[PDB]
């Protein structure tokens, strides 16, 4: 995630295309977020 | 063909194609000209 932040964000700005592909891939693989933020896990950020 | 159609849709709303768009259409259309010539040469002799 630190590497991904360095890719997406630069000079206090968000690169639109990098942000778009990053969120598309992360959201494409739902198991990336962990036990929280997944319906099968049934837990949220608070529970985490 | 699909890539050229997508490029045309990208410029479909724009009033005037800028210089980079003109150069990129030139590249794609020249390559399409070469592909068309080779497809023609595969059948110019009457090879049934």
């Amino acid at each position: 995630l630190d590497f991904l932040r360095f890719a997406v964000f630069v000079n206090g700005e968000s690169v639109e295309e990098n942000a778009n592909v990053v969120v598309r891939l992360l959201i494409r693989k739902p198991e990336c977020f962990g036990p929280a933020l997944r319906g099968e896990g049934g837990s949220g950020l608070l529970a985490a | 063909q699909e890539s050229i159609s997508d490029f045309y849709w990208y410029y479909s709303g724009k009033d005037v194609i800028e210089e980079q768009g003109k150069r990129n259409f030139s590249k794609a259309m020249s390559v399409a000209k070469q592909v068309f010539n080779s497809l023609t040469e595969y059948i110019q002799g009457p090879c049934t």
Binding site: F9, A19, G34, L37 | -
Partner: protein, 49 residues
């Protein structure tokens, strides 16, 4: 780090005002992903002084 990445993937203010379709939908995806109540709760738990 996950939340910080999503915040750094959040679209720009001027883009969201101008109404870019992809920017609006990316912000919508982030909105659906991370519910607000979780954020205010995580801020509400304090440190160990």
């Amino acid at each position: 780090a996950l939340i910080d990445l999503l915040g750094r993937c959040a679209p720009e203010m001027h883009l969201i005002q101008a109404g870019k379709g992809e920017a609006l939908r990316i912000r919508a995806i982030l909105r659906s992903l991370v519910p607000l109540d979780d954020l205010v709760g995580i801020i509400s738990l304090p440190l160990q002084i």
